[PDB]
Design a protein around this nucleic acid. Structure first.
Lengths: 23, 136, 59, 53, 79
RNA sequence: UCAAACUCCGUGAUAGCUGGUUCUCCCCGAAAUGCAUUUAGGUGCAGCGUCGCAUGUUUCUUGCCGGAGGUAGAGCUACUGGAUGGCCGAUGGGCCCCACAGGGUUACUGACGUCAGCCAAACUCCGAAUGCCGGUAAGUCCAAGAGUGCGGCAGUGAGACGGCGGGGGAUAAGCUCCGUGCGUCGAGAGGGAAACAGCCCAGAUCGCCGGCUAAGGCCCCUAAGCGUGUGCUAAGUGGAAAAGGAU
RNA sequence: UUGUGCGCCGAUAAUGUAGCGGGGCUCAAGCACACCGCCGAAGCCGCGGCAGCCAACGUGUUGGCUGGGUAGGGGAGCGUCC
RNA sequence: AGUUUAACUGGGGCGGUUGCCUCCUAAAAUGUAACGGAGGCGCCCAAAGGUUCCCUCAACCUGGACGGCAAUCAGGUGUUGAGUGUAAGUGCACAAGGGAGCUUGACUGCGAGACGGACAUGUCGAGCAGGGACGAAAGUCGGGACUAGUGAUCCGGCACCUCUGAGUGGAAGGGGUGUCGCUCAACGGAUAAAAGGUACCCCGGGGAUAACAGGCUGAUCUUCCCCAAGAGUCCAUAUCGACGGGAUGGUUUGGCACCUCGAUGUCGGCUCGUCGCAUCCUGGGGCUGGAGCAGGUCCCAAGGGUUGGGCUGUUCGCCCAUUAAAGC
RNA sequence: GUUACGGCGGUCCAUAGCGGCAGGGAAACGCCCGGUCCCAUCCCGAACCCGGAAGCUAAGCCUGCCAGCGCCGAUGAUACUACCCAUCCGGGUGGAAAAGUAGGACACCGCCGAACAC
């Protein structure tokens, strides 16, 4: 829950440009 | 309840939720309409709940049109079964609803009661929606 | 008259057409520059790879 | 497939003075077996065969 | 508890094989097809399986003859 | 030590199985896909690699001309099916005049047609882009160290995630299965992302106590701006979030 | 009453703040639009040494391109014993 | 006594299936998977083949003896909505549909160039020759409107040959051409010949692969909310709030199979804790269909405390006797 | 050459069709008379075939008219989309529909033959 969401929301940073691996 | 009497193919893909409306973007037969804004699948039971919500809020006389019909099924498969081994059976029937599309149209004289009724029917649905007058 | 080219980005993350067309124009490294004609050939290559090249014009 | 007494039955089609068995598979609930037939044999030419099994 | 479906039939590699403009020799196969989607015209022949082929060398022209898409062959210019 | 002892011999039994296999540099450099398979963790051939010879730009890229497609989309009194609301009422029918025939009446069920608005992967009168097949004109050209043919030597044949398009699933999964001259990892370091194989940048011949830049960032930790200008924010929002509610 | 840009509530789990990386920040060190500079990589350039492919020339000189690399193919070598 | 007893599989088992044809998925060339979705075949055919010629249906409107929704007839509209041997698609009215006359090309000897292509298989093929059919001739005919309708190799069998004939002459036998013999259907076919158990079990391996546990998601479960039909004597909101809808938490039965099978010891009980609050009591409080005593629901609140006993291995539960209370 | 003629053909085959109105018959296209002769009906000289020209342009056919039933059909915009930018949203360069609209259109072209004429 928390852990997956924080992963999938850290991806919306600026140095990643909206995407990360394994979400 | 709303269902078709027979479909040719009783196991269909899931409809698409991509794009805006092409038709039903214009109130047709009443005066006070409902218009969607999002993408969603709207089922049989929702529309029943909504028309009852409207008829119990005008209660006497004033007409209600439903410009939607659930003519596209979806397939649940029975419980606690590992994935694989086929495709489940149709259990509930949706209509796709693209933004811009019109669902309901009322014809009751007073705008007070009419707008209120449509609001009560909006709060029975999964979509953000708004209310329309036939005017420009 | 002539176009002047300056490769800015890199060919990594870049597809076959873009890579082969940088090769066509003669560009291999970054900051290389080329003095090319402004015919349709060249304009199409730049339409292809505009995100990789700065384009200036002597004329 | 097999060799059951199938509706489509029989074979062999031999020649008079022409030994070149031409083959065909046909039914047998119909009547006939002493007329028609023709084909080209060896050294010979367009002449008449029997269906002789 | 069975899916009684699952079968399928391997391909047959149908469609056009020599498009407009190309040079074809004789007896070459322009299109394989089931029905006469494309019909013959001039210097073109039909097969058993409604395949088409060339009867005279040349080059192609997919034109229509009364509403039906045809295929043709035209004379190359001798060198 | 017994679901058939122990010892020598056959015997160095055999294992599609596990492990292990030793000095250096130079050049090029993958794959995890297809058909078959007593077969699915193995193998054979094709695929992609290199070495040698041959053929010389035939490969690739961009522009222009020629060609078929039935995808997105849209449309339907242009077919097959579903279906909303009206007009008519044949046809049906409660009922009445009562012969039941026949004369009809009434919300009645409503064909067929008709006015209007709609939907569809297995519906299409229609029909894009791209991609594709050939021709042509140049370009690259002290090279891509390209392509094709042949012969030697192989490895791989358990792929992962991300973007786009889609099936199964609950339109859930860091799920599973396909596509893709799309990518990266695999086999790829360095910088940024707080740490972080696949994300963004960029593809490491070795050295220098030299310079300019990308992505990203400039209050201190952390090198660089408590930078300039005009407005908003009062919530520590920034520095997670819905239906809905609210001067 | 419409559409907007930031905002409020809804909001809610178990070793310890703990959903800015921390201190701290609205006397923005926060959001937006324009502007100026700068830092920053093994990238590019600059000075040097080596190497492979090709080419030009002369009795091995120079120049352009090139040089991440596992499975693996090929090439050239050190060392030990007799 | 020697040996066989399949594979796929969202672990294995049970079930189902394995080859071929058609359609969608399939992403406007070809091609493309899944235990994805719909069907079908393991045939028939003196004609349902070849050729020459001729004609157009289905449906509706009307008339009309039995006759009606329809039977055969006549007259109009009718571009094609019928039919095409058999599933579907692509095509067919220019007919490949319907009908009539001759009839055997449902032939022999070949085959340029091409498709598709791992390979073996597979598909069309103009044109040449003999000898024919039909037609006045041109010209068409090497099966069926097309794609499915079947099975490699080996080993044997039948007819014919001016091939060989183990010293000679014959012959057997072996060859060749044309052909036959297989639900080898697990359908690229391990043998011509083969079903099961192991909780007596053993060995080699695997986290490629399952059970406990962790993890991701959250159908399901719990907690909570939105709108308000009504109930509540009237009174939507003291209290319960349907028909539908939106989120949480990650404890429940499950989904995926990502680390661990060269060892992560699994239900309950005891002892020992410590943590959260979505609070059982105590403490403060707002509303009442709260007279008062008792309460009902809601907000804040975690400091402390939160019993002993019977049955069951049991967790859960029920009961007895108490308790300020007998928490999740 | 030419007229309200006939015949064979073509158009990437309705811009050409259907329906209504008027109008023409010199030679030709036709309809019509009748089955003696070839020849023919799954029965019928209806059709096909044969022999002729009493009669009529009524129909077929050709000519003009009617944009009404049908068809054709743009520009511009939109949908969608390739590529690129972009922390979700969305956007930029290029390509570009369907429908709708303005409109078009009662076809065009070629050869031989006739009749007509210098």
């Amino acid at each position: 829950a928390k852990r997956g969401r924080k992963k999938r929301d850290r991806k919306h940073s600026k140095a990643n440009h909206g995407k990360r691996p394994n979400a | 309840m709303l269902i078709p009497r027979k479909v040719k193919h009783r196991k269909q893909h899931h409809p698409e939720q991509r794009g805006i409306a092409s038709g039903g973007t214009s109130v047709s037969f009443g005066d006070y309409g409902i218009q969607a804004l999002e993408h969603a699948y709207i089922t049989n039971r929702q529309i029943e709940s909504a028309r009852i919500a409207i008829n119990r809020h005008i209660k006497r006389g004033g007409k209600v049109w439903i410009n939607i019909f659930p003519d596209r099924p979806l397939t649940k498969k029975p419980a606690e079964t590992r994935m694989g081994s086929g495709k489940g059976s149709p259990e509930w029937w949706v209509a796709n609803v693209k933004p811009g599309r019109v669902l309901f149209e009322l014809s009751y004289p007073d705008e007070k009661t009419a707008r209120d009724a449509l609001t009560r029917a909006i709060h029975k649905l999964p979509i953000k929606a708004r209310i329309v007058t036939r005017e420009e | 008259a002539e176009l002047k080219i300056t490769q800015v980005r890199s060919t990594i993350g870049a597809r076959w057409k873009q890579r082969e067309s940088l090769r066509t124009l003669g560009l291999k490294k970054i900051r290389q520059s080329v003095v090319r004609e402004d015919n349709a050939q060249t304009r199409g290559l730049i339409n292809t790879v505009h995100h990789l090249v700065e384009v200036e014009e002597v004329g | 497939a097999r060799n059951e007494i199938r509706p489509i039955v029989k074979l062999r089609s031999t020649a008079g003075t022409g030994y070149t068995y031409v083959t065909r598979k046909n039914r047998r609930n119909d009547p006939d077996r002493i007329v028609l037939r023709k084909y080209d044999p060896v050294l010979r030419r367009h002449v008449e065969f029997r269906e002789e099994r | 508890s069975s899916s009684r479906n699952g079968r399928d039939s391997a391909a047959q590699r149908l469609g056009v094989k020599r498009f407009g403009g190309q040079v074809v020799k004789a007896g070459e196969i322009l299109v394989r097809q089931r029905g006469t989607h494309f019909h013959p015209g001039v210097n073109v022949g039909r097969g058993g399986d409604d395949t088409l082929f060339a009867l005279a060398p040349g080059a192609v022209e997919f034109g229509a003859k009364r509403g039906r898409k045809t295929v043709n062959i035209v004379p190359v210019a001798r060198p």
